[PDB]
Design a protein around this motif. Structure first.
Motif, short mmCIF file in Angstrom:
data_model
loop_
_atom_site.label_atom_id
_atom_site.label_comp_id
_atom_site.label_asym_id
_atom_site.label_seq_id
_atom_site.Cartn_x
_atom_site.Cartn_y
_atom_site.Cartn_z
N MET C 509 1.18 26.31 43.53
CA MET C 509 -0.13 26.81 43.13
C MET C 509 -1.06 26.96 44.34
O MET C 509 -1.70 27.99 44.52
N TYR C 510 -1.08 25.91 45.15
CA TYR C 510 -1.97 25.79 46.26
C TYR C 510 -1.17 25.20 47.44
O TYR C 510 -1.16 23.99 47.64
N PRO C 511 -0.48 26.07 48.22
CA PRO C 511 0.32 25.57 49.34
C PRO C 511 -0.48 24.87 50.44
O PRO C 511 -0.14 23.73 50.81
N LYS C 512 -1.52 25.51 50.95
CA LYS C 512 -2.38 24.87 51.93
C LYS C 512 -3.09 23.63 51.34
O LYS C 512 -3.03 22.56 51.93
N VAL C 513 -3.73 23.77 50.19
CA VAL C 513 -4.50 22.63 49.64
C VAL C 513 -3.63 21.40 49.32
O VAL C 513 -4.01 20.27 49.63
N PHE C 514 -2.47 21.62 48.72
CA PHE C 514 -1.59 20.49 48.47
C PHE C 514 -1.16 19.85 49.79
O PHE C 514 -1.22 18.63 49.95
CL LIG Z 1 -3.54 26.88 49.18
#
Ligand SMILES: [Cl-]
Ligand SMILES: [Cl-]
Ligand SMILES: [Cl-]
Ligand SMILES: [Mg+2]
Ligand SMILES: [Mg+2]
Ligand SMILES: [Mg+2]
Ligand SMILES: [Zn+2]
Ligand SMILES: [Zn+2]
Ligand SMILES: [Zn+2]
Lengths: 591, 597, 590
Positions: C509-514
């Motif tokens: 869903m969120y590669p950078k955020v995770f």
């Molecule tokens: Cl992300």
């Protein structure tokens, strides 16, 4: 625990400040280093051991070179720094004097205001200081200023008290007693002098200088007066004669005459002490030397000038190469001076605002060691803007008392009178007035608590002041009952819940309250004297590292890591590292 | 309009501070103003000024010699505050006291009150005219000699000037009211003193030719400055036309035993009178002065108690007191000396921003030999370079540098060279060996190169060859008198330059000022245009302006006294301006000044 | 533990430097009571809608809602409520603590809206906490209530469209994680873009509640595009697509009482399926529309607890209930317990002072701009950012102007941001709809990648904008299906350990955020267990904290002192942890 007790003092000071420092100037944020291998050369101390006090006096007389007393560790800071110089700074340099200047006659390092002030203001033992200097400098004579019938205090004491004190002083390491009476009254000196001779130490009887021997219109204090006093003190059993110019009034021409005549009047050697308030005392010291004086006092350059002694380094330099050359190495004098300079900066809190020489001293006659003190009291009594009227009052008050020697404690008595005159706006003519209807100190003196001037006290002022209380003219200690030393020692042992030392009992005989308060603080806070001077006065700034030696062996690494806000009961927690071990010390917030 | 400019000055300093005082200690808020002492009211008695006018300089010198009493010069108005307050002492305070000296101490030889650093610092840091100052002193003390220090080839400057310029300045100085010129060369080079000495005599004024003292005549391990070095020079200066010989002991090096010998010898080598100047850095200079007196010296310098001691002159009141009743008693009332000193103490309190941190005597002086007037300054300069904790290494390097230069007379300007050498040696960690090393590149200070080139003149045995060759990087040095290489100034042309820059005619005095200090004078003149006659302001107002609510009295003219009240000061506006709201003599004045934070 | 160490490091790092999200914002009243979880009555929990859904299954459960006479209630406090009022900054600590209380005190509740929307993103990026952990905790607290999420359809829980198998994979996980009820929406009301998600929710045997987003005004003849037949067709259309429940998502709070009476009679006549109504109270009249909906026979309604209600939030739960109380449709919910839970949320609210907007109250302006309740405040700080605070009402005229330009479109995440970006620019540069017809990244991307509006995009507007050929096909078809075995090895190589299935869903869903969150997890530990003041402001000098590192282990942490900054840049906090002195060094970031 030794450590614990200290950590608590370092917490309290860090959190609350030192009372003596808290709102006076701080030192320039931007340390003294003891100068950098041989054993020590025998000096005057080994010589005194060999000859005894009488013959040693003789050896001084016969000696060609002028002999030097260094006053830095006593008079110097007593005059410039309110006597606040600490044992830590004094003890650390002794070994250096010992190795570097072994020709010195003596170190003046005890007596005067040091005894009092060291306990009362610096939380340290004065006997501990003496011992450490003794250990540092085993080859030099240790000199004290001894106030005759007053010992190291302000009241005249019972004879046995004086006797006891001189006995313990000798045992503590005093070799040379410079003893004086505040009215140059020989009868009041006989007790202390005999006590010194009986310890087989040097009795240097002093004659206080006042007025001006070469002003014919001031004839009370002429040549004969001094020369006869000298002859009287020889008969009294003195080993040395001192001229004590407590206010630096001796002019060069006067020295030239004075010291000729003195040496012709007595076989004894002569020792000259003066202050530089006029800014020409060095001329007088050189004059004295040229007239053959045996020994002179000076202070290390960095604590010299003004109300102190004239400059040691310069006087030595003035003589170097001459017949009377003292043989002290000027490069070593500088090294020790640069140390006292770095020491002195640590006491920024205690500097006066005195900017230079004042020929005004010839008017008022205030003793070097009283000058700043009496300016502080005047500021305290709100008279800062009128200070010159106070000097005029001193001199006027001096005439009133019939023209007298003003040295401790008679000088306070004049001081006390002068301040009242300016405050209560009184003239001498009002003071004497038989109708214009006095400090405790003044009444004390005028009854006869500090002795008799040559004059006798002016009968009209006296009868006015005493108002009722008939005066006595006998010698004070000849009325005081002989203290029950056995019974007076118990009182201080059931008040301290322990046996004390002979030395301690001495401190107590002289200063009952001051010694008491000192002993309690000492059981609370431990050996605070081993703390360096910036730590003693200001604690430990954050992150900072401190080394202290609690005894012979152990050195402690004390680091102030952190200091908490104040908790609910009014407490503050200082977080320490003692030799790598974590310590928390609660200290009460006194704000 | 002179009111307008003065109000503009008061507004600027009130709002922005004075650059010289803004970041220094302030005086006590209490602060008794100085009170000019009330005088009995008997006239002024003819003194040394009337005698000079009657006798001319030569016979007057003779009169000094024959006088049994010792003659005093008071240095308070010049060397005193040069040494202790960075010369910041103002005309307001100096001139207010001249009349008192005149009525109270008529027996004085002279007031030293002009030259040295006062000429430059008055314009540069005090925004006031040194000629105005001299004129006010002249008017207050018409019965006393007025004395200046004159630097021989450097006039009142630091650099060498053409002959015609030195000649011109001396003519203006005589016209301005100077009676007694102490003239010295920083290397005791007589050849280099001749133009000045001749100019002084051509003005029919006192030429007091000075010998600078250095070393120790009683130390046979330092033979270069022995007794005969001084007595030979005294003979040479007399041939060159001196009316008086001075011993200028700029660093306070002369010891009492040496004075006994030097003054006896001098007064046998020459019939001229001798005048002894010294400094109290050692803490025993008074002993040397009294010994000089015992030995027959004709005049001695001292400073009023409240500005004496340490790097200043020794104490005047105490010196006088010690002669009181002697054969050479100088005939000066010490009551009055103490009164004038008390005034000076109140005056000095106003200058807290400029006090040094010096604590008392220092026998270290015999090692470094820094002139009293240089000591504090050099030490500030060392602090400036982060060398504060190594001051004693600077004093040691200063001694070492002196020896490296061949052992020389250190006084303005040669002293500044040695100072520059010392600072560089400590910063760059260089011993004398490193300094002269073949393998070590060293960029010598400009004053050092210039000196070894010849600009300051010739020391008695030349400049050390290998040092010089290394410092000069191939430039060829000279041994002629440096002035003999300078182009005669086109006096007419140059006067036109400054007159076109200021769009007005200047006076001859202003022109001499310009000749000695072209940039500082121009600057000063531009400040006068904007601010008016700021020297009339009392010293607190000059340095601090007016506090909120404060009432100040000020005399813009001899006529009127302006009453000025600071009523309100505005916020900084969107022009960057602040409006000060003054009442002037009950009338409203709104003065706008820039916010310079 | 080292987990304990990690917590001390965090606590020291926030004590010395503050939280970046809170440091330059307003601070809770220095007074401030700890919120107090109310002791709920007895021992067990009465079976509720969760047990019914376990028994009946989704289709039959849908029939059961339909048949029910009482109005059913969704509480949105845990999701939409703080998303609208507090920038989605409400913490797990505060959410989890109250679940059991809901479970005991309001067993009659239909569902708790507590997951989805901005929470997934914001919990990680801004709160340093795991949204799955949060879900588990509510599941454990409320085993008798349905748990409800908002699902952005093909956007899932992000802002972009994702590969079909990613949407499928994420929804599988959401099921295994504890979500019983999915509300699915498409930002253009495009059923073709919904077909994949619904199928996936059915396949996981959970409730598919297919939403229809409301816009315009069915009762204004002058605006015929969104008439009554539009919605009734979409309702019949989503039933063919297999909805268990139909929702009316009134994201902007535009549905008016008279429109509700019509819409809900017509809907229940169009479809057999139960109907669920969500609205926002920006108008200050939404409760009226809620009550109108009930009277017209709607099956379920959404509200927010009193203390997080009104304005851009849902209308007031307690007041709606009090109004229905004693009526034939009485929801059967204790008003006194609603108030007890409200008092709790009020104390919790006060802790989030840093995130309060300056919204004063009702605005009929909402009918002009149509900004979603969830967007309003966001886009206003954003306009603030660019020095437009003073021209804010023009920015509103700009939004409604922009809307007509795109052809009067459904405005909601992410189509709403797209109109946002447009209107902001339009003001910045002083540009008319006549000028407009050099754009922002997302305006060109929608004209190409968000899906198709019923009529299509405007011709000239698409042309002058894209400057490259546009597509009309469903975006999820032109995105090659992500290699799921490959992608997993990548996040697991970077993070130097294998991640759990939930975590691989986060990454998808969120590669950078995770990725950043994982790194932060390793560095500060389980920070989500701290109470909220501590997480945003650290510990005051001498403050005692009680924190639960795990199960039944409480830690006693006291901050005893804080050292000055040392030479090497560091700062040292002096903790006492469980009576044991501890020293933690953190860098002075200031
Ligand atoms: Cl992300
Ligand atoms: Cl006591
Ligand atoms: Cl210039
Ligand atoms: Mg002898
Ligand atoms: Mg003569
Ligand atoms: Mg129903
Ligand atoms: Zn003394
Ligand atoms: Zn000078
Ligand atoms: Zn919503």
């Amino acid at each position: 625990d030794r450590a614990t007790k200290l950590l608590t003092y370092l917490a309290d000071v860090t959190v609350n400040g030192h009372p003596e420092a808290k709102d006076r100037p701080k030192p320039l944020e931007n340390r003294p280093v003891v100068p950098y291998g041989n054993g020590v050369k025998d000096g005057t101390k080994q010589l005194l051991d060999t000859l005894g006090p009488k013959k040693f006096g003789e050896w001084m007389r016969n000696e060609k070179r002028v002999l030097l007393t260094d006053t830095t560790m006593r008079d110097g800071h007593q005059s410039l720094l309110a006597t606040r110089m600490r044992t830590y700074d004094i003890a650390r340099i002794a070994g250096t004097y010992s190795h570097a200047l072994p020709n010195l006659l003596s170190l003046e390092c005890w007596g005067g205001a040091t005894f009092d002030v060291s306990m009362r203001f610096l939380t340290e033992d004065p006997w501990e200081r003496l011992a450490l200097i003794r250990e540092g400098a085993p080859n030099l004579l240790l000199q004290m200023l001894l106030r005759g019938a007053n010992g190291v205090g302000y009241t005249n004491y019972p004879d046995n008290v004086v006797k006891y004190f001189v006995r313990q002083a000798a045992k503590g390491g005093i070799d040379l007693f410079r003893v004086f009476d505040c009215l140059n009254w020989v009868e009041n000196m006989r007790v202390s002098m005999d006590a010194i001779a009986e310890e087989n130490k040097l009795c240097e009887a002093a004659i206080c200088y006042t007025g001006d021997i070469l002003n014919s219109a001031r004839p009370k204090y002429d040549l004969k007066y001094y020369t006869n006093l000298a002859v009287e003190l020889e008969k009294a059993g003195a080993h040395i004669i001192a001229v004590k110019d407590m206010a630096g009034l001796l002019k060069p021409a006067a020295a030239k005459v004075l010291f000729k005549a003195l040496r012709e009047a007595t076989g004894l050697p002569i020792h000259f002490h003066t202050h530089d308030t006029s800014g020409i005392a060095a001329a007088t010291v050189l004059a004295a030397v040229e007239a053959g004086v045996d020994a002179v006092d000076a202070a290390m350059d960095a604590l010299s000038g003004n109300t102190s002694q004239p400059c040691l380094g310069s006087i030595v330099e003035a003589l170097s190469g001459s017949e009377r050359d003292p043989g002290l190495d000027p490069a070593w004098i500088r090294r020790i001076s640069f140390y006292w300079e770095a020491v002195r900066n640590q006491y920024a809190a205690f500097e006066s605002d005195l900017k230079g020489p004042a020929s005004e001293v010839y008017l008022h006659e205030m003793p070097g060691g009283q000058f700043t003190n009496l300016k502080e009291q005047a500021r305290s009594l709100g008279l800062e803007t009128r200070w010159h009227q106070v000097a005029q009052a001193y001199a006027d008050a001096n005439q009133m008392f019939g023209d007298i020697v003003k040295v401790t404690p008679s000088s306070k008595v004049v001081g006390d009178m002068a301040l009242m005159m300016v405050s209560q706006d009184l003239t001498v003519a009002d003071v004497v007035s038989p109708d214009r209807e006095f400090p405790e100190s003044v009444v004390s003196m005028l009854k006869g608590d500090l002795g008799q001037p040559p004059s006798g006290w002016p009968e009209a002022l006296q009868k006015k002041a005493l108002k009722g209380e008939k005066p006595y003219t006998v010698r004070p200690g000849s009325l005081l009952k002989e203290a029950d030393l056995d019974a007076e020692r118990k009182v201080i042992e059931k008040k301290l819940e322990r046996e004390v030392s002979d030395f301690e009992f001495a401190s107590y005989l002289m200063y009952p309250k001051v010694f008491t308060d000192f002993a309690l603080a000492s059981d609370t806070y431990g050996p605070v004297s081993v703390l360096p001077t910036p730590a003693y006065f200001y604690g430990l700034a954050d992150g900072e590292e401190l080394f202290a030696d609690i005894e012979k062996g152990k050195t402690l690494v004390i680091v102030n890591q952190a200091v908490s806000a104040t908790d609910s009961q009014g407490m503050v927690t200082v977080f320490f590292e003692l030799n790598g071990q974590p310590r928390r010390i609660k200290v009460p917030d006194r704000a």
